[PDB]
Write a protein that binds this DNA or RNA. Structure first.
Ligand SMILES: [Zn+2]
Lengths: 116, 140, 101, 50, 112, 151, 59
RNA sequence: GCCCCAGGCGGUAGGGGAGCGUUCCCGAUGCCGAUGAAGGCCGACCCGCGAGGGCGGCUGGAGGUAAGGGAAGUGC
RNA sequence: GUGGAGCCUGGGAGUGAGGGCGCGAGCGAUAACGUCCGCGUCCGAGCGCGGGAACAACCGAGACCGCCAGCUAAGGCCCCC
RNA sequence: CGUGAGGGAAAGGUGAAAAGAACCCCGGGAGGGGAGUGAAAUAGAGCCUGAAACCGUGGGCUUACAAGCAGUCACGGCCCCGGGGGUUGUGGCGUGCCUAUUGAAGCAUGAGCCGGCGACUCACGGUCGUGGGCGAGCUUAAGCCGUUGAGGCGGAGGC
């Protein structure tokens, strides 16, 4: 019984190519180029999953450092403050406070220096 | 709870005295204000740092023998087209271009960086045509 | 009035009448949950240190859900190493009822 | 018992070890033959016994 | 309403005639007749015949008034390339693809 | 394959990829590698296994009550509707695929056209046709050759 | 002369890029002041066969 | 004791294990099919870690085929 | 000392071009990203991750996955960062 | 194609039925539009369906201070369907694949791209394991007889 390629190769290609929509040029038109582009896109997606967390953490540390310096202290001193103060709100929430709750974040400064 | 992004904010002008301050340090703080990383609403992917104007760029000061031992060089692409320029001559000609070079050395690259450099305005001497923009004086 | 709560090793600024997703908690849908409050965000700005003393939010679970299928897919080059793998992280999406003082 | 009830015992019938079918099979690009060598070539070695 | 004629299986380089046809897209009918009439290109004759057959179909077949006849849209797809041999040097042979074209003109009435 | 062994073009300097003749299994039209050949799939199953398993099938249908030894076929005499009135009266509907085993050519020939009946001489008894049909039906003599065959 | 050869295939965008400038400008015509027919300037209107308000060609 | 506990899970050659899919066989004188098969294209729908499977829309117009097993010219 | 520990017997292997690094030697010129050995290591196969600007073997560290959580390693905290 | 021995192609499919498009118009014709048949004509004879590569035409987003293995993450903007989907402006990160190598992004090999063909099997012995039968026993070969897909006999012989 002969089992030609039949429909398999075509269908698999349509899978990878439909995944390759929106790529520049042959990277979204040829199955071969689209395959390889989807490989590198895969590892990219992985290391950017792992990356994005450190990324937003750097954002949070930046904005929080801004709000802290606008009260006379800096990021390291402030974090040492809260850590000494037994406060455990994290970088994201301190960021959204320092943007949205300048008064609340202000009191966070007051207890940070309160540790001092 | 996504991280907050601010809406578009009008850039707040800032005047800075070039006089009496060290080149590298002053350029540092200039770049800092330029990035807008003094603002809690900071975001990297958008230029929301403040406009900056400086006067008395000639009045900058630099440590040691850097007056002459620092050679701003350029390159024309032509053979032997490496044009070395000492710091003194560059002061006599284009001190504002001195600060331009120093702060541009500190800005993040990319089109955002170039637009940020556009966001800066140097003026050697004590004056500048931006009183209409309300240049807020800010000591550093 | 808001408050930052702890959950799944995560901290959430929350306010009453809000739908929020968290780690897949274990609780029957329709049931409610009381949560550690890291800080009362609002008028009575109390600093939970490390948690508020008597406060805790009240959140009814809406139901357990599966996140959109992440296609984590590792790949090494020149080694014939391909790894296609789906992933749909379950979420316990909630409803902020109120914030017990 | 109807024909669709008939089945071998578990493990009574076993897969073959199909080779050369990409990475996911784990038996790919080489058919387990390793890299270059007289053994990895078609035909193989001489009589290994002798 | 729309009209259209098709130069199905026209032996002419489709790329070439596309240059012509991209000179009347978005034009009024009479303007098209002139521009084809004095365009220094071989394809302009073919596009001219396809044009007039088109507009005739509009008035005759589809009964569109000749007043508002502007080129609604037109183009030239490719036909079966007649492959021929060209003897090249050192005995080697090649194949010139004498390219056949399809021409399609569409005539809408420019209202307002 | 019907081609020849003449090398299509030389080994080197021709610019093309190396090839031998077009009879190779890599050209369209070339031969097939490892293609199926005349292959005798038959093999000697153990006698004790054939016999024993046969008895196990008959035990299957028997203990399930789908077995029905029959002595007489007075309704059938070589005509189909004879077998219809018989088997219908014989407690058979047509829904039960029934394995028919007998030595009466009048029975077998008289009922082969039944879409739901599987007819077999008593010698042709075997596990497969026993498993095919819901109900099994045999004559006492067919039962006997069964017994000796399972004896 | 060692037979220069195209290193890679030209992408579609680059091919179309060079083909940007290949537009065919419309041959400017004007109406014949004799017969009101469009025609290229500085030539006898083949419709009227006139030119400069006078007959030249024998249409 | 079907769930809980502890630990484990970079990975080539290579060993092993478990599945997915293709043609054909039995199931099947059955079943699905003009109220539309196969096939093609489309999907932001559901299922599985995946191989993939359904589901739905259109094109297509006549074949397809389970559960559960068998055999391979089986996966580019 | 319970460990993807050990031992025995069978089955299938692949490998028998290795390399860098440190240390101990020879050759070498106490030259070589050199060669040849021993010991350890890593890469190979971990060109997965952070640092080292970039960089397989140097420092940290052995990647099941997801999280817009936290503590830290080498290394850094003047801007780029 | 080869002087010749010889080598050796490609190339199937309308429709149930030609009912194969009378006739009208544009057109030198071709071809086109109508009309007409047709269940259907993107079934029109270059005809089942009709994929991709490729080639156009429209629509949406976007793009001319600008840097890049073409992606990925975030944010944002626009467009659309109503929470999503399409575009990507910026910012961050990011050395194609295969083979062969200690070592490849490699300026080492292969690959223009798409579609299809394409490579671990079969036979017979041996060996290990195993799912089963039997068990100091196990087992049939050829052949014979049966159906015409049904099996049994057959102890020669082997272990
Ligand atoms: Zn005139």
């Amino acid at each position: 019984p002969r089992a030609k390629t039949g429909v398999v190769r075509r269908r698999k290609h349509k899978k990878i190519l439909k995944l390759a929509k929106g790529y520049w040029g042959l990277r979204s038109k040829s199955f071969r180029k689209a395959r390889e582009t989807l490989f590198a896109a895969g590892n990219y997606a992985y290391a950017h999953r792992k990356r994005r967390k450190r990324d937003f953490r750097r954002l949070w540390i930046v904005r929080i450092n801004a709000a802290c310096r606008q009260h006379g202290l800096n990021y390291s001193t402030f974090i040492h403050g809260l850590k000494k103060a037994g406060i455990e709100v994290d970088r994201k929430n301190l960021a959204d406070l320092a943007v949205r709750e300048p008064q609340v974040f202000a009191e966070l400064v007051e207890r940070a220096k309160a540790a001092q | 709870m996504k991280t907050y992004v601010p809406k578009q904010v009008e850039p707040r002008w800032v005047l800075i005295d070039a006089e009496g301050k060290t080149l590298g340090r002053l350029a540092t703080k200039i770049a800092t204000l330029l990035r807008g990383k003094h603002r809690p609403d900071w975001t990297p992917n958008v230029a929301m740092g403040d406009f900056v104007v400086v006067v008395n760029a000639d009045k900058i000061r630099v440590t040691g023998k850097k007056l002459e031992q620092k050679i701003y060089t350029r390159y024309s692409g032509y053979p032997g087209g490496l044009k070395k320029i000492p710091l003194e001559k560059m002061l006599a000609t284009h001190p504002e271009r001195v600060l331009e070079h120093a702060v541009k050395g500190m800005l993040p690259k990319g089109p955002l960086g170039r637009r940020l450099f556009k966001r800066l305005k140097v003026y050697a001497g004590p004056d500048h045509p931006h009183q209409a923009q309300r240049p807020e004086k800010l000591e550093v | 009035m808001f408050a930052i709560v702890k959950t799944g090793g995560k901290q959430y600024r929350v306010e009453p009448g809000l739908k929020l997703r968290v780690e897949k908690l274990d609780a029957e849908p329709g049931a409610t949950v009381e949560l550690p409050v890291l800080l009362l965000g609002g008028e009575k700005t109390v600093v939970g240190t490390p948690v508020v003393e008597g406060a805790s939010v009240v959140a009814e679970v809406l139901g357990h859900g599966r996140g959109k299928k992440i296609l984590v897919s590792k790949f090494k080059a020149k080694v014939q190493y391909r790894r296609k793998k789906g992933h749909r992280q379950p979420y316990t999406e909630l409803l902020i009822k109120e914030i017990r003082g | 018992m109807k024909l669709s009830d008939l089945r071998p015992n578990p493990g009574a019938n076993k897969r073959r070890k199909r080779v050369g079918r990409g990475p996911g099979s784990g038996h790919g690009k080489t058919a387990t033959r390793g890299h270059k060598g007289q053994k990895s070539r078609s035909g193989g070695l001489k009589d290994p016994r002798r | 309403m729309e009209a259209k004629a098709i130069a199905r299986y026209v032996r002419i380089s489709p790329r070439k005639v596309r240059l012509v046809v991209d000179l009347i897209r978005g034009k009024s009918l009479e303007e098209a007749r002139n521009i084809l009439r004095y365009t220094n290109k071989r394809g302009a004759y073919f596009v001219a015949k396809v044009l007039e057959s088109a507009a005739a179909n509009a008035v005759n077949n589809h009964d569109m008034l000749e007043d508002r006849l502007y080129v609604k849209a037109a183009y030239v797809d490719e036909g079966p390339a007649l492959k021929r041999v060209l003897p090249r040097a050192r005995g080697r042979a090649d194949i010139i693809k004498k390219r056949t074209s399809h021409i399609t003109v569409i005539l809408g009435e420019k209202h307002g | 394959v019907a081609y020849s062994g003449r090398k299509i073009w030389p080994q080197k300097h021709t610019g093309r990829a190396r090839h031998g003749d077009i009879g190779a299994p890599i050209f369209v039209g070339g031969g097939v590698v490892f293609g199926p050949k005349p292959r005798d799939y038959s093999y000697t199953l153990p006698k004790k296994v054939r016999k024993k398993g046969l008895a196990m099938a008959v035990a299957d249908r028997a203990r399930e009550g789908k077995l029905l030894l029959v002595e007489a076929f007075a309704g059938v005499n070589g005509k189909t509707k004879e077998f219809l009135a018989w088997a219908k009266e014989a407690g058979l509907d047509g829904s039960e695929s029934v394995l028919l085993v007998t030595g009466n050519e009048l029975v077998r020939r008289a009922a082969r056209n039944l879409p739901w009946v599987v007819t077999l001489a008593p010698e042709g008894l075997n596990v497969y046709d026993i498993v095919r049909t819901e109900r099994l039906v045999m004559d006492l003599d067919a039962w006997e050759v069964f017994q000796n065959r399972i004896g | 002369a060692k037979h220069p050869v195209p290193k890679k295939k030209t992408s579609k965008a680059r091919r179309d890029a060079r083909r940007s400038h290949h537009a065919l400008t419309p041959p400017t015509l004007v109406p014949c002041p004799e017969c009101k027919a469009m025609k290229p300037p500085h030539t006898v209107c083949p419709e009227c066969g006139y030119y400069a308000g006078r007959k030249v060609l024998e249409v």
